[PDB]
């Protein structure tokens, strides 16, 4: 599947530049073109968890007919719960999944693996290792993609979002390897989609979902075209 994505600050659609502040029409049109899943980054909430755009998220989710994954500074059990209650389908967890794996495994137990997506930023280092980092501007955290995935497999890990820190050029080698290694996990790719051929390269790799943000906002291609390409 293609997974169209928006980034939101104070209700404004942004790139990580300003793309207006009417996210709901955009999302609805994404769904209208055949999107089966959408993805939102709450950048405000990522900055300040007290400022979580819950009420906007509620309206957005209510306004489409497809599951929305939402992430952005999710730190607590109560964060997950509040997002789910607002109607989000899947909560996307990034830094906390790296920071507090035993706590997050507890979340898998409470909420179920279908409600959670682990988002891992990956740097391939000098030695060829897929290093996990909590963000593009912090150093590697000292754990490989494989090591962290295998930490969560015992609690039924199903959804992993993997960003090669590509984001915002083409995404292929990395994805072929990890998808082959863990065929029971549905990997999503993020970052590096600049043209429709970037989507093409990911066909065959075993990646299950392709996150597309910027390129849709810049009119490079449409969601419908993305889906046609992805489905071959
Ligand atoms: Cl599919």
From Swiss-Prot:
Keywords: Amino-acid biosynthesis, Cytoplasm, Histidine biosynthesis, Isomerase. The active site is at residues 7, 121. The keyword Amino-acid biosynthesis applies. GO terms for biological process: L-histidine biosynthetic process. SUPFAM superfamilies: Ribulose-phoshate binding barrel. One of its GO terms (molecular function) is 1-(5-phosphoribosyl)-5-[(5-phosphoribosylamino)methylideneamino]imidazole-4-carboxamide isomerase activity. Pathway: Amino-acid biosynthesis; L-histidine biosynthesis; L-histidine from 5-phospho-alpha-D-ribose 1-diphosphate: step 4/9. It comes from the Bacteria. It is found in: Cytoplasm. InterPro entries: Aldolase_TIM, His_biosynth, HisA_bact_arch, Isoase_HisA-like, Isoase_HisA-like_bact, RibuloseP-bd_barrel. Its EC number is 5.3.1.16. Pfam families: His_biosynth. It catalyses: 1-(5-phospho-beta-D-ribosyl)-5-[(5-phospho-beta-D-ribosylamino)methylideneamino]imidazole-4-carboxamide = 5-[(5-phospho-1-deoxy-D-ribulos-1-ylimino)methylamino]-1-(5-phospho-beta-D-ribosyl)imidazole-4-carboxamide. GO terms for cellular component: cytoplasm. Belongs to the HisA/HisF family. PANTHER family: 1-(5-PHOSPHORIBOSYL)-5-[(5-PHOSPHORIBOSYLAMINO)METHYLIDENEAMINO] IMIDAZOLE-4-CARBOXAMIDE ISOMERASE. NCBIfam families: 1-(5-phosphoribosyl)-5-[(5-phosphoribosylamino)methylideneamino]imidazole-4-carboxamide isomerase. This is 1-(5-phosphoribosyl)-5-[(5-phosphoribosylamino)methylideneamino] imidazole-4-carboxamide isomerase. It comes from Salmonella typhimurium (strain LT2 / SGSC1412 / ATCC 700720). The gene is hisA.
């Amino acid at each position: 599947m293609i997974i169209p994505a928006l980034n939101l600050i104070d209700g404004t659609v942004v790139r990580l530049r300003d793309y207006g502040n009417d996210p709901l029409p955009r999302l609805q049109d994404y769904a209208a073109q055949g999107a089966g899943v959408l993805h939102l980054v709450d950048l405000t909430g990522a900055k300040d968890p007290a400022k979580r755009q819950i009420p906007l998220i509620k309206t957005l989710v209510a306004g489409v007919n497809v599951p929305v994954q939402v992430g952005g500074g999710v730190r607590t059990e109560e964060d997950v719960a509040a997002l789910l209650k607002a109607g989000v389908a899947r909560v996307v967890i990034g830094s906390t999944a790296v920071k507090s794996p035993d706590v997050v495994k507890g979340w898998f137990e409470r909420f179920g693996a279908q409600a959670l997506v682990l988002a891992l930023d990956v740097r391939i280092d000098e030695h060829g290792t897929k290093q996990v980092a909590v963000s593009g501007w912090q150093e590697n955290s000292g754990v490989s993609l494989e090591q962290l995935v295998e930490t969560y497999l015992p609690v039924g890990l199903k959804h992993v979002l993997c960003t090669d820190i590509r984001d915002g050029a083409g995404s292929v080698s990395l994805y072929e390897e990890v998808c082959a290694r863990y065929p029971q996990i549905a990997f999503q790719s993020s970052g590096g989609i600049g043209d429709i051929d970037d989507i093409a390269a990911l066909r065959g790799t075993g990646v299950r979902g392709v996150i597309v943000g910027r390129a849709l906002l810049e009119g490079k291609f449409t969601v419908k075209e993305a889906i046609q390409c992805w489905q071959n």
